[PDB]
Amino acid sequence: GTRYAGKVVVVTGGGRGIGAGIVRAFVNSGARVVICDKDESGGRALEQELPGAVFILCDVTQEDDVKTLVSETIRRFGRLDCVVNNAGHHPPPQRPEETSAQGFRQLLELNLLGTYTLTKLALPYLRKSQGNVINISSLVGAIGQAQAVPYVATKGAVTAMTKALALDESPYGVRVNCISPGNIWTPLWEELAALMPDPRATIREGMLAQPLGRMGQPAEVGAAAVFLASEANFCTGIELLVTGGAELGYGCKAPDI
Amino acid sequence: GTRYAGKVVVVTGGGRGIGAGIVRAFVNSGARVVICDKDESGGRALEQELPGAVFILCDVTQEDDVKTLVSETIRRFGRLDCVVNNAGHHPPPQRPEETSAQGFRQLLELNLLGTYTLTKLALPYLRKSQGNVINISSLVGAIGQAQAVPYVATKGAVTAMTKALALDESPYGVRVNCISPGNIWTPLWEELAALMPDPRATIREGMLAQPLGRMGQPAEVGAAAVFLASEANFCTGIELLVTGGAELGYGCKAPDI
Amino acid sequence: GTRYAGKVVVVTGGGRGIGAGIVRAFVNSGARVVICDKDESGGRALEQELPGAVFILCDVTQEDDVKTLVSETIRRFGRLDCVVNNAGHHPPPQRPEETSAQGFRQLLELNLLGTYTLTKLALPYLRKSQGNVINISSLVGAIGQAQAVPYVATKGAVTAMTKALALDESPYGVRVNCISPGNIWTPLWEELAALMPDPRATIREGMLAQPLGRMGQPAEVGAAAVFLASEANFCTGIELLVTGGAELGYGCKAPDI
Amino acid sequence: GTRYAGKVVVVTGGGRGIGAGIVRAFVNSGARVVICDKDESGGRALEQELPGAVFILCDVTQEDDVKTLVSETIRRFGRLDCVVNNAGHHPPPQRPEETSAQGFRQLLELNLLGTYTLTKLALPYLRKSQGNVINISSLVGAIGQAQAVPYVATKGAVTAMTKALALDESPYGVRVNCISPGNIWTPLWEELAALMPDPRATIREGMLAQPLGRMGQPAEVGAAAVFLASEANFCTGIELLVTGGAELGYGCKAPDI
Ligand SMILES: NC(=O)c1ccc[n+]([C@@H]2O[C@H](COP(=O)([O-])OP(=O)(O)OC[C@H]3O[C@@H](n4cnc5c(N)ncnc54)[C@H](O)[C@@H]3O)[C@@H](O)[C@H]2O)c1
Ligand SMILES: NC(=O)c1ccc[n+]([C@@H]2O[C@H](COP(=O)([O-])OP(=O)(O)OC[C@H]3O[C@@H](n4cnc5c(N)ncnc54)[C@H](O)[C@@H]3O)[C@@H](O)[C@H]2O)c1
Ligand SMILES: NC(=O)c1ccc[n+]([C@@H]2O[C@H](COP(=O)([O-])OP(=O)(O)OC[C@H]3O[C@@H](n4cnc5c(N)ncnc54)[C@H](O)[C@@H]3O)[C@@H](O)[C@H]2O)c1
Ligand SMILES: NC(=O)c1ccc[n+]([C@@H]2O[C@H](COP(=O)([O-])OP(=O)(O)OC[C@H]3O[C@@H](n4cnc5c(N)ncnc54)[C@H](O)[C@@H]3O)[C@@H](O)[C@H]2O)c1
Ligand SMILES: O=C(c1ccc(F)c(O)c1)c1ccc2ccccc2n1
Ligand SMILES: O=C(c1ccc(F)c(O)c1)c1ccc2ccccc2n1
Ligand SMILES: O=C(c1ccc(F)c(O)c1)c1ccc2ccccc2n1
Ligand SMILES: O=C(c1ccc(F)c(O)c1)c1ccc2ccccc2n1
Ligand SMILES: OC[C@H]1O[C@@H](O)[C@H](O)[C@@H](O)[C@@H]1O
Ligand SMILES: OC[C@H]1O[C@@H](O)[C@H](O)[C@@H](O)[C@@H]1O
Ligand SMILES: OC[C@H]1O[C@@H](O)[C@H](O)[C@@H](O)[C@@H]1O
Ligand SMILES: OC[C@H]1O[C@@H](O)[C@H](O)[C@@H](O)[C@@H]1O
Ligand code: NA
Ligand code: NA
Ligand code: NA
Ligand code: NA
Structure with missing residues (x-):
């Protein structure tokens, strides 16, 4: 209850899913936590539930x-120590020929440029506090995913951007790291599975993609x-x-011709 | 002179630098090569110089x-076997706070979405020929670079997108790979160095960033x-x-406090 | 003070350096900690200093x-939850032609097979407790190091072995992870630097190999x-x-010939 | 037929499988090729079959x-340009508790120290010719494999050793690289599958572990x-x-508990 006492944290997309798990962990x-979300429902309830979150x-x-968001965080709490760029989206599975440049641009706006924009506006305050940036990327930025060309590209960009900014902000004492979750059971996961022909089979495949045989929890990303x-x-x-080990070993991805 | 005989290759940004080296290698x-470039000067001369390139x-x-570009390639040569997405740009060094979302969008348009667009329009023909895609990414997408947040992000996206599309096109027999060059001596390298306080010192630092002690050549990317x-x-x-080994070992990147 | 309460941890090479930092953190x-070391001096003092360590x-x-070691841990404390395989050595810098197969075998015995042996003998007890294995590898297993062929090979083996065992023990609920430190200021670091022509210059180079501009601390590996x-x-x-970001960006590792 | 004309290559384990494919490609x-093998049968026939191989x-x-091997190569051909360290073995699947330190030592002797020893004895001649080293590692050194702790460890060591030696030999103009194959259809693959309860099912699983839906060929490693x-x-x-893309995407490796 004291590991991050006295610190102020902003979590984007904090109203549900991984973001809410991160809010709870902080x-x-x-810490005092500012929950940012584009939707009021989950985040407003979380503010009522948790003393120390708004x-x-x-x-x-x-x-x-x-x-x-940044000016109100500073006005209300007087400092900013950590920004968690969690807001993001995974579209339904889409074959490459079914994607569009405009859909790709829109997903870049959320998954990449939204992270860029908050980080930029927060960095002057993070420098004052020797604070840090945590970006929520994805395992599939590193290893790829089927039927997700735009999504995968956005997460490869987030992971790479994390390393570039880490280099630039190191002289100022500001650390920049990312977390790449694998399959985490969240409302987005449940929504995507419900779109599939056999949602229950899709969920079972998702569990078994990990050597640990289950999906992860928001609380585990939060820790x-x-x-x-x-x-x-x-x-x-x-x-x-x-990721529960999903990137390890051989699996089902599809004698020498 | 026969390893890729009878094949048709499109190289974007083929008028100079790495692209021209790739054109020459093909x-x-x-192979017959279509040189794509936004500028006429280098590419037109290359077409006069090389029988088999237009x-x-x-x-x-x-x-x-x-x-x-795609319809003319098919009209003139009757097939398409390989697309090399080489067109791209590295801006001058820019501190993170000196970047803009709009500059970032513009660089994404070239380095990422231009690769996406040609690949999409080419894939129906690559499926017919069991052809392949080669994207020119960058080492710094993997390891980061100072004063280059937008550039690094675009190359992380290209490398990740390569893996996603490889998964999607594998059932159709179309391979999708990328090359990540390190420091290659090209007109862009020479132009960026000329902007620096001590261009000669910048070039020397660039050479010594590789264990091999030199920069790479366009011909080496082409091979x-x-x-x-x-x-x-x-x-x-x-x-x-x-990359000449630039990613290997410890170097100068900046007792336990 | 309660994150790992009631748990029993074995730390090899726990008498000084990173190992002692890990002991202190646990x-x-x-937790109750068993300090394993081949030398009595540091570990015996640590047992007197820390209630809860023996x-x-x-x-x-x-x-x-x-x-x-394993049978006494069980006899004295009744369970085993975590094994930290930290014991290891880095020889003085050695050119490849100055190494020997027998020196290589000896370093494998410590850095690799000692980790293998304790893990094997501990795993029956870790299965009962759903415990976990932490191996201390090295960044240079991933990126290489100059004048250290045997050492680098042993750490590449530890990191890979970690992934293999993670796969094998996942059905039994036992996690297997590794930490790859970069330059950590320890008595080994100080001893190796003292062998060099200019120890102070060697230490300064070690600090500046990190974007953060300092070496790491045992306490940071322990956390x-x-x-x-x-x-x-x-x-x-x-x-x-x-690692403090040592693997990021371009550095001094040594125009296109 | 001229890309490596006038050069002399040693291939270890060249009598069958990947090694023979590499011999044929060179x-x-x-090139002139020296086939090294511990068994006479395949390699002797290959020497009769191929002018330019002995x-x-x-x-x-x-x-x-x-x-x-090295002194006879020099005596007979007057130079040495490339060493391909291909000799190696994969034991039958073994659970971690079924392995032994002595079996682990024996596999290290072949897969790691044999590569080390030939490389060491060859490097004086490779320096004279600005030649190069190619080690045959494995994808599973990077991502792990089930029931193969010793094998995986040896290949992690080979890949890491490759990077260390690359650093050390870069000033002398000698390149050191490795190839990490995935599932390649070889006599070893066929022998291991024949040990399994359902060899045909094991082979089918091996094919489908690749997005390309087949195993690789020795000729492809040779190229x-x-x-x-x-x-x-x-x-x-x-x-x-x-590897045919085996490391890409999610697969079958085994809702949030
Ligand atoms: N769930 C997984 O398996 C998984 C795996 C890897 C990575 N991720 C990443 O984790 C993050 C969270 O994913 P999740 O599964 O919790 O998703 P989710 O859809 O359950 O929750 C996302 C939250 O972000 C909010 N949000 C969306 N767009 C926003 C915007 N423009 N501005 C502000 N808030 C916005 C949503 O309203 C929602 O509350 C995303 O970046 C996702 O890419 C998720
Ligand atoms: N030079 C290096 O060290 C280096 C290192 C890693 C990656 N790369 C990548 O290699 C590629 C080539 O780099 P380079 O150094 O040869 O650059 P360059 O600037 O010398 O050549 C780039 C070429 O692409 C063309 N081009 C630019 N924008 C275009 C557009 N919109 N449409 C069509 N053509 C366009 C240019 O006119 C030029 O002929 C780029 O993707 C770059 O990011 C270069
Ligand atoms: N110091 C660094 O920069 C650094 C960096 C990366 C990895 N590492 C790894 O961290 C670990 C600890 O390194 P350190 O710098 O603290 O070293 P250190 O030499 O300061 O401490 C090592 C400890 O291990 C003990 N030890 C050695 N051989 C042993 C054996 N056979 N049985 C039992 N105990 C034994 C020593 O007596 C000593 O107390 C090693 O595995 C090392 O490879 C260190
Ligand atoms: N087959 C695969 O799927 C695969 C995948 C990844 C890596 N590899 C690696 O590729 C290499 C070749 O594998 P393969 O499948 O062709 O095996 P293989 O068993 O079919 O052929 C290996 C050859 O090496 C020889 N050899 C073995 N021990 C030797 C020794 N002590 N001295 C000299 N020669 C010796 C054998 O006699 C044989 O001719 C090995 O290093 C293996 O680990 C293979
Ligand atoms: O959101 C999904 C996801 C999964 C893994 C990741 F690493 C990641 O970043 C996001 C997801 C959920 C459900 C799905 C269901 C079907 C297909 C894809 C799906 N993807
Ligand atoms: O274009 C440059 C570059 C360098 C390495 C890469 F991996 C890459 O993708 C691009 C570059 C050139 C010259 C420079 C000069 C100063 C600073 C950065 C510079 N970058
Ligand atoms: O022990 C050293 C070391 C450094 C980095 C690592 F990642 C690692 O695993 C071990 C070390 C210390 C001091 C030195 C001094 C000179 C040369 C090498 C040296 N290595
Ligand atoms: O030799 C095998 C192998 C496979 C993939 C690699 F990347 C590698 O280095 C070696 C192998 C063959 C057949 C098998 C059959 C069952 C289990 C494991 C098997 N392994
Ligand atoms: O909707 C799937 C899961 O989403 C998570 O964020 C919630 O914490 C869980 O209660 C829920 O089961
Ligand atoms: O401008 C730097 C270099 O660019 C390369 O693309 C050209 O092939 C070289 O002739 C030139 O020296
Ligand atoms: O010897 C170098 C350093 O080693 C560390 O393990 C100790 O905690 C420090 O007190 C010491 O300065
Ligand atoms: O035994 C499996 C395969 O091994 C390869 O090395 C041979 O070239 C093939 O002819 C054979 O089918
Ligand atoms: Na509240
Ligand atoms: Na022409
Ligand atoms: Na004690
Ligand atoms: Na012959």
Whole structure:
């Protein structure tokens, strides 16, 4: 309850799923948390539930929303120590020929440029506090995924951007790291599975993609985020895998012709 | 002179630098090559110089230019076997706070979406020929670079997109690979160095960033591209490093406090 | 003080350096710790200093020493939750032609087979407790190091072995992870630097190999180990980098000929 | 037929499987090849079949055999340009608790130290010719494999050793690279499958572990080796994946508990 006491954290997309798990983990570590989300429902309830968390409506694709998010965080709490760029989306499975450049641009706006924009506006305050940035990327940025060309590209960009910014901000004492989750059971996972012919079979395949035989939990991503913020003082530019071992070994991906 | 005989290759940004080296390597392997570039000067001369290469003016950020590039390649040569997505740019060094979302969008349009667009329009023809895609990414997508947040992000996206598309096109027999060059001596390298306070010192630092103690040549990237196209039939989704060992070992990147 | 309460941890090479930092971190988390070392001096003092830590003399290259280490841990504390395989050595810099197969075998015995042997003897007890294995590898297993062919090979083996065992033990609920430190200021670092022509210059080069501009501390590796043991329940087979960003960007490793 | 004309290549384990494919590829490129193998049957026949290849009986675990291999290569052909360290073995699947330290030592002797020993004895001659080293590692050194702790560890060591030696030999102009094959259809693959309850099912699983839906061929590893030797002059310390995409995407490796 004291690992991150006295610190102020902003979590984007904090109203449900991984983001809400990260919010809870930081509150449990003693921090004050600003929950950013484009939707009011989950985040407002979380603000009522958790002493030490407050909700600010903010769409990270809207630069003026993000400017207000940062200025209100500083006005209300007087410092900013950690930004967790969690807001993002995975579209339904799409074959490459079914994608469009305009859909790709829109997904880049959320998954990549929203992370870029908040980070940029927050960095002057993170420099003052020797704070840190945590980006939520994805394992599939590293290893690929089927029927997800735009999504995979956006997460490869987030992971690479994390390393570039880590280099640039290292002289100023600001660490920049990312977490790459694998299959985490969240409302997005449940929504995507419900679109499939056999949702239950899709969910079973998702569980068995991990050597551990289950999906991950938001709380497990949250613990990884609290570690990076509060105890990983010699880590910058890392990609922390929270995947249950999905990237390990041979599997079903499809004699020598 | 026969490793890729009878095949038809499109090289974007083929008028100078790495692209021209790739053009030359494919012509030397027996292929017919379409040189795409937004600038006429280098590519037109290359078409006069090389029997088997022709020049088509085409800005890869302009979807209708790219549509015409593909339709003219098919009209003139009757097949398409390999697309090399080489067109790209590295801006001058820029501190993160000096970047803009709009500059970032513009660089994504070239380095990422131009590659996406040509690949999409070419894939129906590559399926017919069991052809392949070669994207020119960058080592710094993998390891980061200072003062280059947008550039690094675009190359992380290209490398990840390569793996996603490799998965999607594997059932159709179309391989998708990338080359990640390190420091290659090209007109872009020379132009960026000339902007620096001490261009000669910048160039010396660039040479010594490699264990091999020199920069790479366009011809060396070209040989790697010809290998991927013509002889790497069990390679898909790989990132072929052509970096002189820059990613190896400890170096100068900046007692325990 | 409660994150790992009630748990029992064995740390090899725990008498000084990173190992002692790991011992301290686990004691501070509420665990009981068995300090294994081949030398009595540091570990015996640490046992007097820390309530909750005890010292067992044990050379991890001697199978019967390791058998007794495990049986005494169980006899004295009734369970085993975590094994930290930290014992290892880095020889002085050696050019490849100055190495020997017999020196290579000896270093494999310590850095690789000692880790293998303790893990094997501990796994029946870790299965009962759903415990975990933490191996201390090295960044240079991943990126290489000059004048260290045998050492680098042993750490590449440890990191790979970690992933293999993670796969094998996943059905039994036992996680297997590794930490790859970069330059950590330890008595070994100080001893190796003292052998060099200009020890102070060697130490300065070591600090500047990190974007953060300093070396790491044993306490920072220890915090990473406590995270992996106590809060990383969806992590198995990962390589957690604790390197200060040394693997990022271009540096001094040595125009196109 | 001229890419590697006038050059002299040693291939260990060249009598069958991948090694024989590499021998054939180098002969087809114009090189003279010394086939090293511990067994006479395949290699002697290959020497009769291929003008430009000769067979030398040599067990790479026996230092005096390897000394004679190098001295006879120089005596008979007057130079040495490339060493391909292909000899190696994969034991039958073994659960971790079924392995032994002594079995692990024996596999290290072949897969790791045999590569080390030939490389060491060859390097004085490779320096004179600005030649290169190609080690045959494995994809599973990078991603792990089930029931193969010793094997995986040996290949992680080979890949890491490749990078270390690349650093050390870069000032002398000698490149050191590795190839990491995935599932390649070889007599070893066929022998291991025949040990399983349902060999045909094991082979089908092996094919489907690749997005390409087949296993690789020795000839495909051979083409990769010829590329590294003859045309990859700015590549050193790389790991060239010849895996059919097995490392890409999610698969079958085994809702959030
Ligand atoms: N669930 C997984 O398996 C998984 C795996 C790897 C990575 N990720 C990443 O984790 C993050 C969270 O995923 P999730 O599964 O929890 O998703 P989710 O859809 O359950 O939750 C996302 C939250 O972000 C909010 N959000 C979306 N767009 C926003 C915007 N423009 N501005 C502000 N808030 C916005 C949503 O309203 C929602 O509350 C995403 O970046 C995702 O790419 C998820
Ligand atoms: N030079 C290096 O060290 C280096 C290193 C790693 C990666 N790369 C990548 O290699 C590629 C080539 O780089 P280079 O150094 O040869 O650059 P360059 O600037 O010398 O050549 C690039 C060529 O692409 C053309 N081009 C640019 N924008 C275009 C567009 N919109 N449409 C069509 N053609 C366009 C240019 O006119 C030029 O002829 C780029 O993708 C770059 O990111 C270069
Ligand atoms: N210091 C670094 O920069 C660094 C970097 C990366 C990895 N590592 C790894 O971290 C680990 C600890 O390194 P360190 O710098 O603290 O070294 P150190 O030499 O300061 O401490 C090592 C400890 O292990 C003990 N030990 C050695 N051989 C042993 C054996 N056979 N049985 C039992 N105990 C034995 C020593 O007596 C000593 O107390 C090693 O595995 C090393 O390879 C260190
Ligand atoms: N087959 C695959 O799927 C695969 C995948 C990845 C890596 N590899 C690696 O490729 C290499 C070749 O494998 P393969 O499948 O062709 O095996 P193989 O068993 O079919 O052929 C190996 C050859 O090496 C020889 N050899 C073995 N021990 C030797 C020794 N001590 N001295 C000299 N020669 C010796 C054998 O007699 C044989 O001719 C090995 O290093 C293996 O680990 C193979
Ligand atoms: O959101 C999904 C996902 C999964 C793994 C990742 F690493 C990641 O970043 C996101 C997801 C969920 C459900 C799905 C269902 C079918 C197909 C794809 C699906 N993807
Ligand atoms: O274009 C450059 C570059 C270098 C390495 C890469 F891997 C890459 O993709 C591109 C470059 C050139 C010259 C420079 C000069 C100063 C700073 C950065 C520079 N970058
Ligand atoms: O022990 C050293 C070391 C450094 C980095 C690592 F990643 C690692 O595993 C071990 C070390 C110390 C001091 C030195 C001094 C000179 C040369 C090498 C040296 N190596
Ligand atoms: O030799 C095998 C192998 C496979 C993939 C690799 F990447 C590698 O280095 C070696 C192999 C063959 C057949 C098998 C059959 C069952 C289990 C494992 C098997 N392994
Ligand atoms: O909807 C799937 C899961 O999403 C998670 O974020 C919630 O914490 C779980 O209660 C829920 O089962
Ligand atoms: O401008 C730098 C270099 O660019 C390369 O693309 C050209 O082939 C070289 O002739 C030139 O020296
Ligand atoms: O010897 C170098 C360093 O080693 C570390 O393990 C100790 O904790 C430090 O007190 C010491 O300065
Ligand atoms: O035994 C499996 C395969 O091994 C390869 O090395 C041979 O070239 C093939 O003819 C054979 O089918
Ligand atoms: Na509240
Ligand atoms: Na022409
Ligand atoms: Na004590
Ligand atoms: Na012959």
